[PDB]
C-alpha cells in the first residue's frame, strides 16, 4: 500500500513522498502520459509499468511487510500480490536513491500539457 511505499522512499532518499514525488514530472504521482522528463521520472514510469503487470492486485491499498537487512530492502512472504507489489516498490525506492543527484525542483507540480507523447511499457 501507499503506506509502505512512502516509508520506503523516506528511508531511502530522506525526502517525503508527498510532495517530493506525488507530483513530479509526467509519471510521478497521478496519471501517466508523455515522455519521462528525467531519470527520476523514468523511475516512476517503470514503477507505473510494474504495477501494470499486476492487473488483479491493488497496489495502493494492499499492505505488505518488508524488513531491512542492514541497508537492504527485503520483502517478506505474504500473498502473491503482496510479494510482487513489494518488489515493484523496492525497485522504485532504489531507483530514486540512485538518481537523487539529478532530482530537479523545476519538475515538481509539472503542468499536464507539457507531457507530450506515448511510450509503451
Amino acid at each position: 500500500s501507499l503506506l509502505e511505499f512512502g516509508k520506503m522512499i523516506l528511508e531511502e532518499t530522506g525526502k517525503l513522498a508527498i510532495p517530493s514525488y506525488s507530483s513530479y514530472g509526467c509519471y510521478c504521482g497521478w496519471g501517466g502520459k508523455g515522455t519521462p522528463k528525467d531519470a527520476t521520472d523514468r523511475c516512476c514510469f517503470v514503477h507505473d509499468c510494474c504495477y501494470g503487470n499486476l492487473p488483479d492486485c491493488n497496489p495502493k491499498s494492499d499492505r505488505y511487510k518488508y524488513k531491512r537487512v542492514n541497508g537492504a530492502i527485503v520483502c517478506e512472504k505474504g500473498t502473491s500480490c503482496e510479494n510482487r507489489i513489494c518488489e515493484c516498490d523496492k525497485a522504485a525506492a532504489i531507483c530514486f536513491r540512485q538518481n537523487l543527484n539529478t532530482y530537479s525542483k523545476k519538475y515538481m507540480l509539472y503542468p499536464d500539457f507539457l507531457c507530450k507523447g506515448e511510450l509503451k511499457c
Binding site: 503506506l3 511505499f5 513522498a17 508527498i18 514525488y21 506525488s22 504521482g29 497521478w30 516512476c44
Partner: peptide, 5 residues
Amino acid sequence: FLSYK
C-alpha cells in the same frame, strides 16, 4: 503516511 506516488 505521506505517499500517493
